[PDB]
Design a protein around this nucleic acid. Structure first.
Length: 174
RNA sequence: CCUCUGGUGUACCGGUUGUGACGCCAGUCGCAUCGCCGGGUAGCUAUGUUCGGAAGGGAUAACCGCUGAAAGCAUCUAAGC
C-alpha cells in the first residue's frame, strides 16, 4: 500500500502516545483516541510516524493503510481542524444557533431543534448558511449528514440543505 | 356491567269467558296453552352502558449513510461508527 508506506508528520505541538492498542493524539483541540488493529504496528521515530504490518499479509497491509489514514486525519484535526459548511436554498428556509442547539425552519408545519453532540460547534453568519467546526472529521461528517437528511435537496429547483461543494442533479418537469 | 333504555319475568297484582264445586247470596278455588287479556319486582340479558387496541424502549428488513483502505483516485466495508 502506497498510503501505508507514506509517512505522517507531527507538526510541532501535538503529542502521540500509546498504550496497548490505544493510540492517543493530543493537541490544542483535544484528545483523540484510535484503537489499533492487531496486524498493524506503529513506530514513532523523530517527528514522523510510520505504520507497517506485523506480517506480510495483504490484510495486514490493508489495515496499515487504514490506520495511517485515520491517524493522519486525527493529527490534522487536533492542530488545524476541519470545517464543513452547509447551505440552505428555498423561500423561508432559515437556521439559527442558541448555544448547543440549531433551530431550523425548512417548510414543515413545525421547526426542528437539532442538538449538537459534544465536540462540534456551529456558526450562522447568515440565516441561509451554517458552518460546522470540529477536530473529529468523522463526527463532523456525521453531523453534517444528519442536518442534510433533515431536508435533502430536490432536483427540480434545488431546494433544501446542501453541502457547499456538492453537485446537484437538476431535471425539468415534463 | 345492569345506574339508564328495553325484553323476559308459568311462585307478584288486576280485568274477563265457559264450566264444576265450596249448603245458598256474597266471596272464592279447580280446569280450559300461565284459559285468555293488561301490567310488572329481583335475576338473566342486548338492541342498553362503560372501557380497550395509548405511549415508549431494544435489535433489525429493504434502503440511506459517516470516516476509510485493499486499488496514491473513487468506494456504506474489509478495521471502526
Amino acid at each position: 500500500s502506497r498510503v501505508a508506506k507514506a509517512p505522517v508528520t507531527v507538526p510541532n505541538g501535538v503529542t502521540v502516545t500509546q498504550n496497548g492498542r490505544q493510540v492517543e493524539v493530543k493537541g490544542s483541540k483535544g484528545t483523540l483516541s484510535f484503537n489499533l488493529h492487531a496486524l498493524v504496528e506503529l513506530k514513532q521515530e523523530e517527528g514522523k510516524l510510520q505504520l507497517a504490518p506485523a506480517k506480510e499479509s495483504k490484510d495486514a497491509w490493508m489495515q496499515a493503510g487504514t490506520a495511517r489514514a485515520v491517524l493522519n486525519n486525527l493529527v490534522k484535526g487536533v492542530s488545524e481542524g476541519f470545517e464543513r459548511k452547509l447551505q440552505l436554498v428555498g423561500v423561508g428556509y432559515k437556521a439559527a444557533v442558541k448555544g448547543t442547539v440549531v433551530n431550523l425552519n425548512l417548510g414543515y408545519s413545525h421547526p426542528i431543534d437539532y442538538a449538537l453532540p459534544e465536540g462540534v460547534t456551529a456558526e450562522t453568519p447568515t440565516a441561509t448558511e451554517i458552518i460546522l467546526k470540529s477536530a473529529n472529521k468523522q463526527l463532523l461528517g456525521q453531523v453534517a449528514a444528519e442536518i442534510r437528511a433533515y431536508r435533502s435537496p430536490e432536483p427540480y429547483k434545488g431546494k433544501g440543505v446542501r453541502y457547499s461543494d456538492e453537485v446537484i442533479l437538476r431535471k425539468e418537469a415534463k
